[PDB]
Amino acid sequence: AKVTELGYLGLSVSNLDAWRDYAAGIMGMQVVDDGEDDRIYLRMDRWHHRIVLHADGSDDLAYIGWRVAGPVELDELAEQLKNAGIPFEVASDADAAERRVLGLVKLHDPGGNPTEIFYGPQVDTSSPFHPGRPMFGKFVTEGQGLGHIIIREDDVEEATRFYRLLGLEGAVEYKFAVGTPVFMHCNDRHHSLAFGVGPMDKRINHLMIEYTHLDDLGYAHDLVRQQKIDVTLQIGKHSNDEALTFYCANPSGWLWEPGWGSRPAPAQQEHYLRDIFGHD
Amino acid sequence: AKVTELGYLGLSVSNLDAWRDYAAGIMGMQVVDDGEDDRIYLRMDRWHHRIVLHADGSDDLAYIGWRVAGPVELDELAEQLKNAGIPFEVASDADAAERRVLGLVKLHDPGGNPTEIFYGPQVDTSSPFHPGRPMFGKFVTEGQGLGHIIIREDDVEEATRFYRLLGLEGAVEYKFALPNGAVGTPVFMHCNDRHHSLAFGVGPMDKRINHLMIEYTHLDDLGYAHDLVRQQKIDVTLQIGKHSNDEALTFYCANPSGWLWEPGWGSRPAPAQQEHYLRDIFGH
Amino acid sequence: AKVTELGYLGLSVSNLDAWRDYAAGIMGMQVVDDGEDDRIYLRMDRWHHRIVLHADGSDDLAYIGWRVAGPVELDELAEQLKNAGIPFEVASDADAAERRVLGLVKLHDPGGNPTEIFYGPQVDTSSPFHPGRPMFGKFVTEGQGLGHIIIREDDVEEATRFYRLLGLEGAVEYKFAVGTPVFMHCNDRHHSLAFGVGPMDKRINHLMIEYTHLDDLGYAHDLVRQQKIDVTLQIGKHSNDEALTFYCANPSGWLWEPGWGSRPAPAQQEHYLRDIFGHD
Amino acid sequence: AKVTELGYLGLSVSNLDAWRDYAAGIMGMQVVDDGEDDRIYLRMDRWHHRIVLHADGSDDLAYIGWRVAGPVELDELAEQLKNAGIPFEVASDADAAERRVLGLVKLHDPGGNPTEIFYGPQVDTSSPFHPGRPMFGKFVTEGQGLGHIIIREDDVEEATRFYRLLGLEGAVEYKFAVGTPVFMHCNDRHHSLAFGVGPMDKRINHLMIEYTHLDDLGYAHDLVRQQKIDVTLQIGKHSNDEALTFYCANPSGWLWEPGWGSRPAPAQQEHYLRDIFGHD
Amino acid sequence: AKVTELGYLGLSVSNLDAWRDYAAGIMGMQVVDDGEDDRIYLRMDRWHHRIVLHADGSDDLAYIGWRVAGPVELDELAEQLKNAGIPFEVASDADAAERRVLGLVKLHDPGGNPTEIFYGPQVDTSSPFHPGRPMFGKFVTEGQGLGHIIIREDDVEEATRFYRLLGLEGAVEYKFALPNGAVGTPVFMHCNDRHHSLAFGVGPMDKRINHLMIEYTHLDDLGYAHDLVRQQKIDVTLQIGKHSNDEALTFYCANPSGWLWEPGWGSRPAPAQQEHYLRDIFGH
Amino acid sequence: AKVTELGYLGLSVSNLDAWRDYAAGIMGMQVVDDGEDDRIYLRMDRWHHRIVLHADGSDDLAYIGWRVAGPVELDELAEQLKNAGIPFEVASDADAAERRVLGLVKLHDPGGNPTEIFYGPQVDTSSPFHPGRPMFGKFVTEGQGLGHIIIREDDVEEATRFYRLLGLEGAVEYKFALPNGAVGTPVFMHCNDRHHSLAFGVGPMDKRINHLMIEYTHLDDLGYAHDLVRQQKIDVTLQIGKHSNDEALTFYCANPSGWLWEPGWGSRPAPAQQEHYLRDIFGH
Amino acid sequence: AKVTELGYLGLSVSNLDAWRDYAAGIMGMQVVDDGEDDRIYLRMDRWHHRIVLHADGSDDLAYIGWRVAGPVELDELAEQLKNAGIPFEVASDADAAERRVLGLVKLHDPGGNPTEIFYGPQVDTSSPFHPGRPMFGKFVTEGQGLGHIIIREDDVEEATRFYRLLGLEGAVEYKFAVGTPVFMHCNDRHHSLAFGVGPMDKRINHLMIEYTHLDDLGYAHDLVRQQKIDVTLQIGKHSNDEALTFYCANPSGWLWEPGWGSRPAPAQQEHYLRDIFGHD
Ligand SMILES: [Fe+3]
Ligand SMILES: [Fe+3]
Ligand SMILES: [Fe+3]
Ligand SMILES: [Fe+3]
Ligand SMILES: [Fe+3]
Ligand SMILES: [Fe+3]
Ligand SMILES: [Fe+3]
């Protein structure tokens, strides 16, 4: 059994309203507020949500959810963890219900990042995704997860071995003291996960989200320029994912990377020395 | 040169608010309001609009706009009308501006229905379609027009001839027995892949327009619309069903102007060749 | 080895003639009467039959037949049952011949439902399916079974484990005391089997049958309206199978669900809270 | 490891010239005579030959050759035979060279039929197949073998178990004392092998060969009528292979079944009670 | 019979070396030098060339060459020009040789822009395209011509009519407010799959040509070009963006003659039918 | 209405036996002998034949047969010839029988080459093509004709005009320097998917025909033919190579009548539009 | 784990300039000179290089690199070697960096040929392949390796067993004392490797490189004729790969075989007695 996608992210945020303007108003996500006093959701497709916003007054990552196919696969994965010596917790039904999933395992990666493994997300088929701003197209999520994240690790090699155990595949992809970021995938998305990018003040460095239509990235690019917001990396392409993407600050003080046209991971490992173009 | 699609409809209404709730809130169209005194717009795709709503107090059809490919084609059609001795007005640039088109000709069909032929609709490709209720998919319009309409014609043969001149094709599609032994023979006509764009010969009518069909790309949006209408007790005069001709899955129901909208899914193209039916397939 | 489809159903019925009018006259199945004094068959495609009508004077389920690929797979499955502690019976040749199959294993599921596992159904290739009323198209059966059934179970978890052992895959699909129906598949049909829907007076709740052509469902819908028969659920869509279907009473006092446009099961487990539209 | 196709047949024949008129002159096979004093070959495609004609004065089967993918697969298959208790002989290089193959295992099936297992047939790529009469099209052989054969067995069940060990798959396909012919396949050809058809005077009952073009079967049908030769079964279709074929006597006193439009074997076992049409 | 593509451009330049560095060194074109005194060539595909560079001292457009399918088609177009009372020169074999074509007619458009119509370009299929900087892919030209241009026209309606005669199709593509309440209505026209080959009506211009669009098959080549231009501080007058009409991803920037090149990727075809816009999609 | 393909060739030969060995034994054609005194046939596909061999003592081309779709089309072409004042003979049913066709017209091209136009060739669909040496594949002929030929024309422009009337399309395909400063401009023409069916303007010729190209579906048959020719020392006057125009892989070599056959593989279609070359791609 | 392609070759050469004229000037490869004093590279596609030219004054093979998918596969392959008794060396990071790979295992085949196994080649995505002469098309390398090589072995059977252990598949393909060349593949390229061709003065007999466009082979054929260079085998086709190729001398005194239109290896082993055409 292997994880199949990056299913959801929990975020700790200090300012819900600013996140509404940003994620729905600019990025085109749908705000879902089910009445809960301490959280709201962000929806990108059929699923009830892909991202949870916990208004706990912090501004960092709360948890990463990795999907598996069903209860049998969840059990096989739990057993693999037990055999590897890795502490985990089979969540109760009520804890799974909090996450809007049927079954859920909670644990941590070797960098201390809260990591969850689940099957059976809540899908709202009867209430179509309705974007928070006008969209030409949709988001790329089908079988591919919500996007990709760079997260903090203190032991790159331990993290890699942990993530291969979960089912992800990958290796170092750039050589840039030579530093060696590692990139990993579990489906057709080039990667869902990367680490070893150097010292980081927060648990998460960025999140790349992907549009089906190029016109939606331009629409977002222009809203960000009009709203006169911080751009860290300009429009361009990495050698690895070969996607067209830009990097801007979110209300939590880290980066979102809205994108278009990401390719699949090569079936065999490669490594690069530099990006294709842009990203200035 | 011929008409290529049913491009837009002008509607006279007496209650804008009801229309907004109906067309956007249930059907999923986008309300476009340009700050005009007397009118708002309904949008279904990239075009600035497909339906104009003139808040004038009446509840009927105001005008029907038929698209042609371009200026040369508009000239060619104008000359054909003149050579048929059909009167028409060459609209100026301000009349074309008012309709959001590049050029147009204004006229009447034999039944007195105000009829426009235009090229160059306004398309808002910077502001994508944003439906007025959540939608699963979109509207079927590309190269097919807004949908199909049923309109009043006192002279069926005169209307048939008028619309063959414009470039529409078709003929009688159904035969049915009337009370006195007569035979009703409604005429259905198309100008593109859409089974038909136009019909008439369905008998006496108190308004110029009887119904409008609009088509969803996704059945679940038809399902959704149906559900809100049941939630809000609107008159579905004809239940879910298939006509023999268009072989579409549709339900008929009442709009705020007192006539019928027929939301539908899965319309088939107009056959290569003319055929007719005595009855429909199922439902309705 | 795994079961590949829901191959056949045996029904106990009190009124054969009424079943002829219903299943052939309305639904478009073919009545096959081979001279046997206590039964007649219903045929939907190439197979000799998909359903057996036993005129024993009862009005419920008699047996469920699950197909396997051949004698080797039947043996591997019998061995899996022996290893699990589940009593079974390898039918004799004459018992297999009664069912019109080459090899047959008889047993019961944990709810006490008679369950059969077979290979090699009788197929009448030289006598084409001829519908009991005029049909635009056909039934959807190829590699997909005859349709799907909701059956009674007293132990939802035991039933699930039993059915996974047989080769089916699935889980809970709706949360609606929270009740949790389970749905299962063994091929491209969304599901062949569901249970845990609540208390049931009979062994079987319904049977969904599927038309290739939409026009055939309308034809049946209209015959049911003309014959002024009981409709329990109106035309609509479940979130899970995303099929267009209606629910009406059969002469045995349970439901048939004639349908159109059922999709495959998602490759990974999901759960819903409500249907898409209709089914009032 | 499994056998992949029915690769070649060795025949013992009493009259080479009559076989030339028949197989090349009517059927459109190519006569290959490499100078050997006791044999000539029949070629149907790229291979040097598909059939060997041994002029030993007998009129029956000499051997059946089953192809495997290479030397590794040949070894795995030899090992499976050793483990099953089945005597075999690894042919020497010179014995393999006689057969025009690189590696060859000789043995017998439970009915005593000489059976060979080989890899690496001689292919004459530089000398295109040239038919013995004018042909519209070609023969169907690619990845499918030369055709199919009914052979004699005294123990139907032993033969089946032997043939499954070799890699073939199948079961009984007709019920017609009820007799139960077994049909087996190892590729896209409906079957390569059948037995249990009742008492037979010879080792082989027939050989079906298949044309790509319908017009070639008609051409052969007409030559057979003009030459006023024996027809046993008229043009028609079996329920199982669903091919269009006729049955005529060859100069050895058994049947050839020239054919067209044979379908693949169903992915799951079926059984019939009668043919579709024809074969009178 | 009609023009089929924008085949070549003749350019007057004052500095060959700068052009070589710009067109080849950055854009990826191949410099072709045939040992002529006064001119070199720029190549983008199998054709001997798409752009001629006459080192005469001026910095402007010299001529525009439009392709037709063959000799019969050239005759047919010649007769149409004559029947319209438009003057033209039938070039001799040496004039055709100079242009690397089999036949041609020379003339002027209403704005005085030297205009040629030809069949039979020279194609060097023994010496494949070899770009002047490493390229990921190639240029989009097949049956689409070199790209599209914006040129000076004092009389927009006269030019429109002139180019409909040649066989191009199109009309006004945008409307925008001018200072005095006027409406600018630029005309965009096509003769093949390329959205447009030609535009004008964009206002006063000091040179005959305003810009040229060239299209890469691969985005990474657009990316590459963009990067070298940033490395060499050339004026990108308009940043990465999409026009509503061609829906292409392009950036505008200055060439050594003082006007604009617009390298681009992913242009869409010209719609079956005329439509217009009030604004563009994004960027620029 | 136009010619659709080069249908057949009539050849005068002085040695049948050599031809049989060459055309069948090496090229893979089928010899068809109908028991006629004076002639045998060469077959390449379903047609009774593509080449007639008249054993009359001369070694040259006898006639060229061009196919049209049917009788109406033959009439239309006949009337076009008459309206051009080109003389022709309407063949009777026995003349059509002799050619194995349903109808035909007989005439001359400007260079005196006997020229026939026919519909309805005889097709032997009961006796499939059986090649005269083992073949891997077949000949390319469907809707493309037998191949292409080079023929003698004293007046290139007159011939061009003659063949545009018949319905062939094309123009000059190459330019090359002659000794005296002149320019040779051979004309290549097509009437279907085959790059060309016909060429001329290659200079002085002692026979009416210079070469014939035939095309194999499979390269291995080209390879096979090449090998037998090397085994039998026939003159391959031009080695394996690609022309710029047809972009085919072919080798030229001598037949028993003293002129050239060019067996080939992988010919490309004639481009949508006319283009020309100064040289060829490789080899030859 | 198996090797996936013939990734790179190291060559020892006496004359760098002559190799530049040959490989770039004629063949259309790109010369990459990164400043190193003892070597330059030849590039054929995205990779930094496919061939290394070591100017050590010798004129033969230096090493053969076989690609594997990643570090896990490299480990599984290293373990297979340890289990087989075959000495190997896990290269250090700096040794892998010298080769422009992320991980590297060094060893020898049974003929003494230096053999390397690596994952993660350096790819220069931001600097497109730019040919050393004008090219119509490109080289065929994607998932197929750089081409194929005939190398020297003293023990044909040992070499075969060694190469099957690495993941390659194959056997004897020609019978021509009967000699028996062996051909092997690990992807869609007919073969990457062949040996047993008879006595050889050098470690490598030839290298076949493949063009996507036929016109590029003709362009090279003509440059070789104009430069009036040695041709050993004329244009033609082998029965096995069915490619169109010619054989000419390189500045190191062995053969390059520029080619076009090579087919995949047959899924099952064959053997031939002669080539199709040409190669005189
Ligand atoms: Fe990223
Ligand atoms: Fe309607
Ligand atoms: Fe159901
Ligand atoms: Fe048979
Ligand atoms: Fe532009
Ligand atoms: Fe030629
Ligand atoms: Fe080779």
DSSP chain B: ----EEEEEEEE-S-HHHHIIIIITTT-PEEE--S-SSEEEEESSSBS-SEEEE-SS--EEEEEEEE-SSHHHHHHHHHHHHTTT---EE--HHHHHHTTSSEEEEEE-TT--EEEEEE--BB-TTS----SS--SS-B--TTT-S-EEEE--S-HHHHHHHHHHHT-EEEE-B-EE-TTS-EE--EEEESSSBS-SEEE-S---SSSEEEEEEEESSHHHHHHHHHHHHHTT---SEEEEE-TTT--EEEEEE-TTSSEEEEEE-PPBPPSS---BSS-SEE-
Separation between Cα atoms, residue E207 and residue E188, nearest integer Å: 19
- Residue with token string 């190799």: G19
Asked if residues C193 and C201 have their Cβ atoms less than 8 Å apart, the reply is no
Asked if residues G216 and G222 have their Cβ atoms less than 8 Å apart, the reply is no
Asked if residues D269 and D196 have their Cβ atoms less than 8 Å apart, the reply is no
Separation between Cα atoms, residue F207 and residue F13, nearest integer Å: 13
In which element (H, E) is residue G206 found?
strand G204-211
Query: Which residue on chain G is closest to E132 by alpha carbon?
Result: G130
- Residue with token string 């003149």: B82
Kindly report the three-state secondary structure assignment for every residue of G229-261. Answer: CCEEEEEEECCCCCCEEEEEECCCCCEEEEEEC
Q: At E136, list the tokens.
A: 């990921």
Chains touching C (at least 3 CB pairs under 8 A) are: A, B, D
Q: At B145, list the tokens.
A: 């027009």
* CA angle (G102 as vertex; G99, G108 as ends), nearest 5: 55
Chain B partners of E272 at a C-beta cutoff of 8 Å? 4, 69, 143
Q: Residue D63 in 3-state DSSP?
A: strand
Distance B199 CA to ligand 2 centre (A): 8
The DSSP code sequence of C44-83 is: -SSBS-SEEEE-SS--EEEEEEEE-SSHHHHHHHHHHHHH
Torsion of CA E41, E46, E48, E50, to 10 degrees: -50
Separation between Cα atoms, residue B99 and residue G210, nearest integer Å: 61
Kindly report the three-state secondary structure assignment for every residue of C95-123. Answer: HHHHHCCCEEEEEECCCCCEEEEEECCEE
Query: Which residue on chain A is closest to B219 by alpha carbon?
Result: A126
Q: At C183, list the tokens.
A: 């749905």
Chain center to CA of C214:
20
Asked if residues F170 and F3 have their Cβ atoms less than 8 Å apart, the reply is no
Distance C181 CA to ligand 3 centre (A): 12
Q: Residue C236 in 3-state DSSP?
A: strand
Chains A and G touch (3+ CB pairs under 8 A): yes
Asked if residues C211 and C260 have their Cβ atoms less than 8 Å apart, the reply is yes
To the nearest whole Å, the CA of D72 is away from the closest chain G CA by 9
Bridge partners of E254, per DSSP, are E260
Q: In 3D, which of B60, B20, B54, B51 has the Cα closest to residue B38? A: B54
Separation between Cα atoms, residue D193 and residue D205, nearest integer Å: 11
To the nearest whole Å, the CA of E260 is away from the closest chain F CA by 30
The number of C-beta contacts closer than 8 angstroms across D and G is: 50
Q: In 3D, which of A181, A173, A176, A194 has the Cα closest to residue A268? A: A173
CB contact under 8 A, C119 and D273: no
Pairing of strands A39-43, A51-54: antiparallel
Torsion of CA D208, D209, D210, D213, to 10 degrees: -130
CB contact under 8 A, E120 and F274: yes
Ligand nearest to the CA of C279: 3
Q: At E229, list the tokens.
A: 């231009």
Asked if residues G31 and G169 have their Cβ atoms less than 8 Å apart, the reply is no
Q: At what angle do helices D156-166 and D71-84 cross, to 10 degrees?
A: 140
Question: If phi over 0 gives left and psi between -120 and 50 gives alpha, with beta otherwise, what is residue B201?
Answer: left
Binding site membership of A: which residues? 110, 148, 154, 206, 247, 257
Separation between Cα atoms, residue A194 and residue A185, nearest integer Å: 9
Half-sphere exposure of G268 (CA within 13 A, CB side): 26
Q: After which residues is chain G broken (C to N over 2.5 A)?
A: 176
Q: At A149, list the tokens.
A: 């994240």
Binding site membership of G for Ca(2+): which residues? 110, 154
Q: At G42, list the tokens.
A: 């030849």
Angstrom CA distances, A269 to A170, D48, D56, G101, G119, stand at: 7, 43, 61, 10, 6
* Residue spans per domain, chain A: 1-134, 136-280
Q: What are phi and psi of D249, to 5 degrees?
A: -65, 140
- Residue with token string 């209505």: E185
CB atoms within 10 A of CB D228: 7
Please name the CATH architecture into which domain D1-134 falls.
Answer: Roll (3.10)
Asked if residues A6 and A193 have their Cβ atoms less than 8 Å apart, the reply is yes
Separation between Cα atoms, residue G208 and residue G203, nearest integer Å: 15
Q: At C169, list the tokens.
A: 């895959």
Bridge partners of D65, per DSSP, are D8, D116
Q: Report residues near ion ligand 7: CB below 5 Å.
A: G 208
Half-sphere exposure of B63 (CA within 13 A, CB side): 19
**C103: Cβ contacts below 8 Å, ≥ 6 apart:** C71, C74, C91, C96, C118, C119, C120
Question: If phi over 0 gives left and psi between -120 and 50 gives alpha, with beta otherwise, what is residue G278?
Answer: left
Q: Which one of E48, E123, E129, E193 makes the best mutation probe of the F interface by having the most chain F beta carbons within 10 Å?
A: E123
* CA angle (A51 as vertex; A45, A52 as ends), nearest 5: 135
To the nearest whole Å, the CA of D111 is away from the closest chain G CA by 29
Pairing of strands B60-67, B114-119: parallel
Angstrom CA distances, A253 to A29, A152, A225, A230, G6, stand at: 19, 16, 17, 10, 47
Q: How many residues does chain C have?
A: 280
Distance D257 CA to ligand 4 centre (A): 7
Angstrom CA distances, A250 to A205, A209, A227, B180, stand at: 11, 13, 12, 75
Q: At C244, list the tokens.
A: 């267009």
Separation between Cα atoms, residue D154 and residue D45, nearest integer Å: 34
Bridge partners of D185, per DSSP, are D169
Q: At G39, list the tokens.
A: 């070597």
Nearest by CB: F274 against E70, E125, E143: E70
Asked if residues C129 and C24 have their Cβ atoms less than 8 Å apart, the reply is no
The reply to whether CATH 3.10.180.10 applies to domain B136-284 is: yes
Q: At F200, list the tokens.
A: 């001329």
Chain F partners of G215 at a C-beta cutoff of 8 Å? 242, 247, 281-282
Q: At F49, list the tokens.
A: 């034949």
Q: At F142, list the tokens.
A: 């469907």
In which element (H, E) is residue F93 found?
helix F93-98
Chain C partners of A119 at a C-beta cutoff of 8 Å? 171, 268-269
Neighbour-count burial of B35, counting CB atoms closer than 10 A to its CB (0-12 exposed, 13-18 middle, 19+ buried): exposed
Greatest Cα pair distance, chain G, in angstroms, is: 54
Q: At F211, list the tokens.
A: 């070469």
Asked if residues E120 and F274 have their Cβ atoms less than 8 Å apart, the reply is yes
Q: Does residue C109 have a known ligand-binding role? A: no
Asked if residues C210 and C50 have their Cβ atoms less than 8 Å apart, the reply is no
Q: What is the CA radius of gyration of chain G?
A: 18
Query: Which residue on chain D is closest to F125 by alpha carbon?
Result: D136
Asked if residues D8 and D29 have their Cβ atoms less than 8 Å apart, the reply is no
Q: What is the DSSP letter of C142?
A: T
CB contact under 8 A, F171 and E119: yes
Neighbour-count burial of C182, counting CB atoms closer than 10 A to its CB (0-12 exposed, 13-18 middle, 19+ buried): buried
Distance G245 CA to ligand 7 centre (A): 8
CB atoms within 10 A of CB B44: 23
Asked if residues G59 and G14 have their Cβ atoms less than 8 Å apart, the reply is yes
Separation between Cα atoms, residue G246 and residue G243, nearest integer Å: 10
Asked if residues A238 and A275 have their Cβ atoms less than 8 Å apart, the reply is yes
Would you list which residues of chain B are within 8 Å, Cβ to Cβ, of chain C?
219-220, 223-224, 226-227, 230, 240-242, 247, 249, 266, 281-283
Q: Does residue B154 have a known ligand-binding role? A: yes
Angstrom CA distances, F114 to F10, F111, F209, stand at: 10, 9, 12
To the nearest whole Å, the CA of G246 is away from the closest chain A CA by 32
Q: At C280, list the tokens.
A: 């009032």
Would you list which residues of chain E are within 8 Å, Cβ to Cβ, of chain G?
127-131, 134-136, 220-221, 224
Distance C210 CA to ligand 3 centre (A): 10
Overall resolution, Å: 2.2
Bridge partners of D115, per DSSP, are D64, D107
Q: In 3D, which of F103, F113, F35, F44 has the Cα closest to residue F72? A: F103
What letter represents residue G53's amino acid?
L
Half-sphere exposure of D155 (CA within 13 A, CB side): 11
CB contact under 8 A, E282 and B122: no
To the nearest whole Å, the CA of G217 is away from the closest chain E CA by 12
To the nearest whole Å, the CA of C106 is away from the closest chain D CA by 19
Sign of CA dihedral D155, D161, D163, D169: positive
CB contact under 8 A, D171 and C119: yes
Separation between Cα atoms, residue F246 and residue F262, nearest integer Å: 13
Q: In 3D, which of F121, F114, F116 has the Cα closest to residue F77? A: F116
Q: In 3D, which of C187, C204, C100, C222 has the Cα closest to residue C150? A: C204
Nearest by CB: B102 against E164, E276, E280: E276
Q: In F164-179, which positions are buried (b, 16+ CB within 10 angstroms) versus exposed (e)? A: bbbbbbbbbbbbeeee
What letter represents residue B251's amino acid?
F
Pairing of strands E249-254, E260-265: antiparallel
Edge-to-edge strand ranges of the sheet holding E282-283: E169-172, E187-190, E198-200, E148-151, E209-216, E260-265, E249-254, E238-242, E282-283
**G65: Cβ contacts below 8 Å, ≥ 6 apart:** G6, G7, G8, G9, G10, G99, G101, G116, G117, G118
- What is the CATH number that goes with domain A136-280? 3.10.180.10
To the nearest whole Å, the CA of A226 is away from the closest chain G CA by 32
Separation between Cα atoms, residue C96 and residue C116, nearest integer Å: 10
- Residue with token string 């028409």: B88
Q: Residue A233 in 3-state DSSP?
A: strand
The shares of helix, strand and coil residues in chain F, as percent rounded to the nearest 5, are 20, 35, 50
Q: At what angle do helices G71-84 and G156-166 cross, to 10 degrees?
A: 140
Separation between Cα atoms, residue E10 and residue E99, nearest integer Å: 9
